[PDB]
């Protein structure tokens, strides 16, 4: 597990940063309650699926995780986009 969870965790920390990157490259003054907004969501899929990769007793599902994180902060900027 412990080698394997840690990859899990870090795929998903790259892609939480980078799409906030991203969310901060496309973003202007005005608009950054909205900037904020998604940093708060993202941080939060970040938190709970940090807890279920370290707290897996399955390690079928830690490779899994990382794609439900991914979804997760996708349907957060699809629903943020609009």
Known sequence: LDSERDKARKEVEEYVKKIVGESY???TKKRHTITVALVNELNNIKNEYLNKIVESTSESQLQILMMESR?????AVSKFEK
């Open 71 to 75: 979804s997760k902060v996708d349907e």
């Open 25 to 27: 490259a496309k973003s």
